[PDB]
Amino acid sequence: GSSFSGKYQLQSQENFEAFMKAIGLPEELIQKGKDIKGVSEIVQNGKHFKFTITAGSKVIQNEFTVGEECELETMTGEKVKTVVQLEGDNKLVTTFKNIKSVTELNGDIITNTMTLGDIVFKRISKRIGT
Ligand SMILES: CCCCCCCCCCCCCCCC(=O)O
Ligand SMILES: CCCCCCCCCCCCCCCC(=O)O
């Protein structure tokens, strides 16, 4: 299975600044990063996932197997041990650092929602070729 596989780019986001402040992203990276339409690349092979998030020179590479312990490198660079689960046929769900993350794919649109307390940080991305 390779349902999530693809190359995607941010179209729009909500609450970037409030969320990144709350998690402790350096102010310099908040200000430089707020208008970056980052590129996300996902390679899925059954339960095994590799994903790359690129925003300028900043490249975050992660991998996990659904249902197994993984170590996810977050935006600050903090690495957190967690588990990513499938929810329904189109969602990837996990929690780290008290952040609830939901990644939902519908056709060529991926929506990622991260909520920390009352702060909801929503990203909409669109497939950009192969
Ligand atoms: C060359 C100047 C450096 C640019 C630094 C960019 C700062 C990163 C911006 C954060 C983008 C948010 C990515 C989160 C991805 C996700 O939620 O899955
Ligand atoms: C960098 C923070 C760790 C991310 C934790 C979520 C792991 C499951 C989702 C992986 C697919 C990545 C899709 C991201 C799309 C986007 O950039 O908004």
Curated annotation (Swiss-Prot):
Residue(s) carrying Phosphothreonine: T52
Intracellular or extracellular location(s): Cytoplasm
InterPro entries for this protein: Calycin, Fatty_acid-bd, ILBP
Molecular-function annotations in GO: antioxidant activity; chromatin binding; fatty acid binding
Gene Ontology BP terms: cellular detoxification; cellular response to hydrogen peroxide; cellular response to hypoxia; fatty acid transport
Role noted for this protein: Plays a role in lipoprotein-mediated cholesterol uptake in hepatocytes. Binds cholesterol. Binds free fatty acids and their coenzyme A derivatives, bilirubin, and some other small molecules in the cytoplasm. May be involved in intracellular lipid transport.
Record-given protein name: Fatty acid-binding protein, liver
Organism this protein belongs to: Homo sapiens (Human)
